[PDB]
Structures are given as structure tokens and as C-alpha cells.
Amino acid sequence: GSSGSSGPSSSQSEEKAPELPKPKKNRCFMCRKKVGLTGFDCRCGNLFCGLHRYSDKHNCPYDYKAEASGPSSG
Ligand SMILES: [Zn+2]
Ligand SMILES: [Zn+2]
């Protein structure tokens, strides 16, 4: 425990703030909307409100689509 008082001596910035923004915060990773239980875990390792879950909705980087049982050239 210590007060620790050192320059700058003048200070005009201090106020309660909400903990840092979680990496998920039970919120979509495309629109950033409260999904909580209505969340959707994509293969790319992200969360979606189901409306973006699709791969062609949030531009899913993953390739699982053209990885297994998917000889689709590309
Ligand atoms: Zn969404
Ligand atoms: Zn994805």
C-alpha cells in the first residue's frame, strides 16, 4: 500500500469506467450485438448472433467449407 505522488503534479482526469471490453462479451463478432444464449460459434473461432453465423455473411476466413468433402477447386 502506497500513495505514490509524483509529477505531473496537476491532474484533471479520473472517473469510474467499465472493465476493459472482453474479446467476446457474449456479443456478435460481426455486428457486435447482445446474443448471450442466442449466440453462434463459427469454425473460424468467432461468435455470431446467428444472423451472420453463415460463412458468406460475415466473410468467414475459414475454409472448412472447401476443406472436407469439398473438392471444389479453390
Ligand atoms: Zn450479428
Ligand atoms: Zn466464421
Curated annotation (Swiss-Prot):
Expressed in brain, muscle, eye, and heart, lower expression in lung, kidney, and spleen, and very low expression in liver. Expressed in myoblast C2C12 cells (at protein level). Zn(2+) 3 binds at residues 42, 44, 58, 60. Residues 13-22 have a biased composition (Basic and acidic residues). Disruption phenotype: Resistance to muscle atrophy accompanied by abnormal accumulation of polyubiquitinated proteins in skeletal muscle. Zn(2+) 2 binds at residues 28, 31, 49, 52. Induction: Up-regulated after TNFSF11 stimulation. Expression also induced by other cytokines such as TNF and IL1B. No significant inhibitory effect on the NF-kappa-B pathway is observed. Expression is increased in both denervation- and fasting-induced muscle atrophy. A zinc finger (AN1-type) spans 22-68. It comes from the Eukaryota. It is found in: Cytoplasm. Involved in protein degradation via the ubiquitin-proteasome system. May act by anchoring ubiquitinated proteins to the proteasome. Plays a role in ubiquitin-mediated protein degradation during muscle atrophy. Plays a role in the regulation of NF-kappa-B activation and apoptosis. Inhibits NF-kappa-B activation triggered by overexpression of RIPK1 and TRAF6 but not of RELA. Also inhibits tumor necrosis factor (TNF), IL-1 and TLR4-induced NF-kappa-B activation in a dose-dependent manner. Overexpression sensitizes cells to TNF-induced apoptosis. The A20-type zinc finger directly binds polyubiquitin chains and associates with the 26S proteasome. The zinc-finger A20-type domain is essential for inhibition of NF-kappa-B activation. Homooligomer and/or heterooligomer. Interacts (via A20-type domain) with IKBKG and RIPK1 and with TRAF6 (via AN1-type domain). Interacts with ubiquitin and polyubiquitinated proteins. Identified in a heterotrimeric complex with ubiquitin and SQSTM1, where ZFAND5 and SQSTM1 both interact with the same ubiquitin molecule. This is AN1-type zinc finger protein 5. It comes from Mus musculus.
